[PDB]
Design an enzyme around this catalytic site. Structure first.
Site, PDB file in Angstrom:
ATOM      1  N   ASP A  90       0.853  -1.201   0.000  1.00 36.21           N
ATOM      2  CA  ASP A  90       0.000   0.000   0.000  1.00 36.21           C
ATOM      3  C   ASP A  90       0.884   1.245   0.000  1.00 36.21           C
ATOM      4  O   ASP A  90       0.855   2.051   0.933  1.00 36.21           O
ATOM      5  CB  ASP A  90      -0.840  -0.041   1.278  1.00 36.21           C
ATOM      6  N   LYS A  92       0.993   3.784  -2.097  1.00 38.28           N
ATOM      7  CA  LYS A  92       0.290   5.041  -2.423  1.00 38.28           C
ATOM      8  C   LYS A  92       1.234   6.047  -3.091  1.00 38.28           C
ATOM      9  O   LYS A  92       1.392   7.168  -2.642  1.00 38.28           O
ATOM     10  CB  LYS A  92      -0.394   5.568  -1.150  1.00 38.28           C
ATOM     11  N   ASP A  95       4.185  10.697  -6.963  1.00 40.55           N
ATOM     12  CA  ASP A  95       5.316  11.513  -7.405  1.00 40.55           C
ATOM     13  C   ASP A  95       5.324  11.392  -8.921  1.00 40.55           C
ATOM     14  O   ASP A  95       4.502  10.684  -9.495  1.00 40.55           O
ATOM     15  CB  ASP A  95       6.623  10.982  -6.777  1.00 40.55           C
TER      16      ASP A  95
HETATM   17  C1  U5P Z   1       7.833  16.547  -6.596  1.00 40.54           C
HETATM   18  C2  U5P Z   1       6.628  17.234  -6.856  1.00 40.54           C
HETATM   19  C3  U5P Z   1       6.494  17.839  -8.119  1.00 40.54           C
HETATM   20  O1  U5P Z   1       5.452  18.488  -8.409  1.00 40.54           O
HETATM   21  N1  U5P Z   1       7.454  17.722  -9.055  1.00 40.54           N
HETATM   22  C4  U5P Z   1       8.605  17.062  -8.775  1.00 40.54           C
HETATM   23  O2  U5P Z   1       9.480  16.915  -9.645  1.00 40.54           O
HETATM   24  N2  U5P Z   1       8.791  16.454  -7.548  1.00 40.54           N
HETATM   25  C5  U5P Z   1      10.118  15.827  -7.284  1.00 40.54           C
HETATM   26  O3  U5P Z   1      11.082  16.905  -7.515  1.00 40.54           O
HETATM   27  C6  U5P Z   1      12.244  16.431  -8.232  1.00 40.54           C
HETATM   28  C7  U5P Z   1      12.417  17.010  -9.652  1.00 40.54           C
HETATM   29  O4  U5P Z   1      13.775  16.682 -10.012  1.00 40.54           O
HETATM   30  P1  U5P Z   1      14.291  17.052 -11.511  1.00 40.54           P
HETATM   31  O5  U5P Z   1      13.254  16.835 -12.564  1.00 40.54           O
HETATM   32  O6  U5P Z   1      14.789  18.505 -11.516  1.00 40.54           O
HETATM   33  O7  U5P Z   1      15.439  16.062 -11.697  1.00 40.54           O
HETATM   34  C8  U5P Z   1      12.100  14.917  -8.242  1.00 40.54           C
HETATM   35  O8  U5P Z   1      12.810  14.396  -7.091  1.00 40.54           O
HETATM   36  C9  U5P Z   1      10.581  14.703  -8.167  1.00 40.54           C
HETATM   37  O9  U5P Z   1      10.324  13.494  -7.445  1.00 40.54           O
HETATM   38  C1  U5P Z   2      -5.545   3.692   2.209  1.00 33.87           C
HETATM   39  C2  U5P Z   2      -6.411   4.490   1.459  1.00 33.87           C
HETATM   40  C3  U5P Z   2      -7.614   4.886   2.030  1.00 33.87           C
HETATM   41  O1  U5P Z   2      -8.436   5.556   1.401  1.00 33.87           O
HETATM   42  N1  U5P Z   2      -7.903   4.569   3.294  1.00 33.87           N
HETATM   43  C4  U5P Z   2      -7.079   3.807   4.025  1.00 33.87           C
HETATM   44  O2  U5P Z   2      -7.385   3.503   5.190  1.00 33.87           O
HETATM   45  N2  U5P Z   2      -5.859   3.375   3.475  1.00 33.87           N
HETATM   46  C5  U5P Z   2      -5.005   2.447   4.234  1.00 33.87           C
HETATM   47  O3  U5P Z   2      -5.896   1.328   4.450  1.00 33.87           O
HETATM   48  C6  U5P Z   2      -5.749   0.844   5.812  1.00 33.87           C
HETATM   49  C7  U5P Z   2      -6.974   1.086   6.733  1.00 33.87           C
HETATM   50  O4  U5P Z   2      -6.705   0.334   7.926  1.00 33.87           O
HETATM   51  P1  U5P Z   2      -7.813   0.350   9.117  1.00 33.87           P
HETATM   52  O5  U5P Z   2      -8.412   1.734   9.225  1.00 33.87           O
HETATM   53  O6  U5P Z   2      -8.895  -0.655   8.841  1.00 33.87           O
HETATM   54  O7  U5P Z   2      -7.007   0.004  10.331  1.00 33.87           O
HETATM   55  C8  U5P Z   2      -4.553   1.585   6.391  1.00 33.87           C
HETATM   56  O8  U5P Z   2      -3.346   0.814   6.247  1.00 33.87           O
HETATM   57  C9  U5P Z   2      -4.503   2.877   5.587  1.00 33.87           C
HETATM   58  O9  U5P Z   2      -3.166   3.292   5.358  1.00 33.87           O
END
Ligand code: U5P
Ligand code: U5P
Lengths: 257, 257
Positions: A90, A92, A95
């Site tokens: 999970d 999620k 990026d």
């Molecule tokens: C995170 C959020 C977003 O909106 N855009 C992004 O690029 N990121 C993170 O920033 C870094 C961009 O690196 P670069 O393209 O200049 O090499 C990267 O670490 C991405 O995960």
């Molecule tokens: C992920 C997405 C979402 O919309 N809601 C969530 O609860 N999660 C993940 O699922 C698990 C829920 O566990 P519980 O509330 O039954 O204990 C948890 O691992 C959360 O990260």
């Protein structure tokens, strides 16, 4: 037209990982995914072994395991094969494509190496799916897209949910379904998995909301319940798993006919 | 009524972490954040030491480090304290409050133990912040909320972006600003950090989009550029860091006066 899990496993456009899952759900009469939210490897493995016969899937957060090692995951894979359940990390992912590729393949966790399934938020655009896909495709992995969330204030609604559904349809080679609170696609080859499930009414103190198996599977048309605390907090986690299993299975039977 | 970084560092409602960051930005004449996207600890530490003088902040993805240990983080902190930059773990949390709490404090990474700053998506609703806050506040940390993304097809637009801003204002004890493509708050206590930055027009093969420092700092009113590949892929990384620093710094000076 509602189909059994067994039949859905044979749909022409079904991903082999989805077909493997649906077949075992049918065989074992379970649509219960255990959310194994524990911090010790010993507890995770003990849960996986004991509850393995009652679940179709074990959902992990490997980034909360204090003593993670790849050998822990090897022993988990052994139990998954022995008891017949899939492993769902999970993670999620949320990026850009170039980053999630590495987070999925690499680092200490090497998630793609042991996880049958992962999931991704759609907020970054389809690039997030394209990046995971580059890794997951040859390895016969699948991905779930987060179309809705269970938490109070969730922004995964309306047009956001629709974009999630479109993104899934457009990448059906790798996207095998959704994290959602109810049916969001009418295509039967997509799996719907629903967190925020408990037998009792309530929530937690940090925005989580709960609905019952009957509501989620019966009324809302979801396929699988994801249950953490409802099971994990019980004194007897096997008894609790069976309770959730029977609830979710019967809700599914009633929807079928 | 725009104030210098040095003046913003002294604002009554300023968060300590933001104040420390603003003061070193003024001292060092840098509003450049290096995105150190490498898979080896040695390379992380090398880049941090070599480029430390040119940067206000070093952004990490510790989950891509093939050889992470908490000792590698102890050492990163040494370099951060020596060269005077903050450490920002670009974890992009996107789960329910209860889960993100453990993902921030625990597991193998113990992010909260070494990261001055982290970030979080707003999609789960405010519980994602309340969860992180429970860990971050005792540890004197700060958080950025992801109001906009750089990538093609980003859903972090319109009402979503507004929701991010509100969430921040309502959690100003822990939220110190945003990941965004432009200024999204008029409150000078909030920082804006912008990824997707390169001198030349372009993008990558998986949805990344680039704008120049002058556009992002100058026209769009952001505070800090985040640059990865623009620097790391250059033959001369020091000269590359210096070009981005000088571009971003001059754009800030011109906007200011
Ligand atoms: C995170 C959020 C977003 O909106 N855009 C992004 O690029 N990121 C993170 O920033 C870094 C961009 O690196 P670069 O393209 O200049 O090499 C990267 O670490 C991405 O995960
Ligand atoms: C992920 C997405 C979402 O919309 N809601 C969530 O609860 N999660 C993940 O699922 C698990 C829920 O566990 P519980 O509330 O039954 O204990 C948890 O691992 C959360 O990260």
């Amino acid at each position: 037209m509602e189909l059994s899990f067994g039949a859905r496993a044979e749909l022409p456009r079904i991903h082999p990982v989805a077909s493997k899952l649906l077949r075992l759900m049918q065989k074992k009469e379970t649509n219960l995914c255990l959310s194994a939210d524990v911090s010790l490897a010993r507890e995770l493995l003990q849960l996986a072994d004991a509850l393995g016969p009652s679940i179709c899937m074990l959902k992990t957060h490997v980034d909360i395991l204090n003593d993670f090692t790849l050998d822990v995951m090897k022993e988990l894979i052994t139990l998954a094969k022995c008891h017949e359940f899939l492993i769902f990390e999970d993670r999620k992912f949320a990026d850009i494509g170039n980053t999630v590729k590495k987070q999925y393949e690499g680092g200490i966790f090497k998630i793609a190496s042991w996880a049958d399934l992962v999931n991704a938020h759609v907020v970054p655009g389809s690039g997030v799916v394209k990046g995971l896909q580059e890794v997951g495709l040859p390895l016969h992995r699948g991905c779930l897209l987060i179309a809705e969330m269970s938490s109070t204030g969730s922004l995964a609604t309306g047009d956001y949910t629709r974009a999630a559904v479109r993104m899934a349809e457009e990448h059906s080679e790798f996207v095998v379904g959704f994290i959602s609170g109810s049916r969001v696609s009418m295509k039967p080859e997509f799996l719907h998995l629903t967190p925020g499930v408990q037998l009792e009414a309530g929530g937690d103190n940090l925005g989580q909301q709960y609905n019952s198996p009957q509501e989620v599977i019966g009324k809302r048309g979801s396929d699988i319940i994801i249950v953490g605390r409802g099971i994990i907090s019980a004194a007897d986690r096997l008894e609790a798993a069976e309770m959730y299993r029977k609830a979710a299975w019967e809700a599914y039977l009633s929807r079928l006919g």
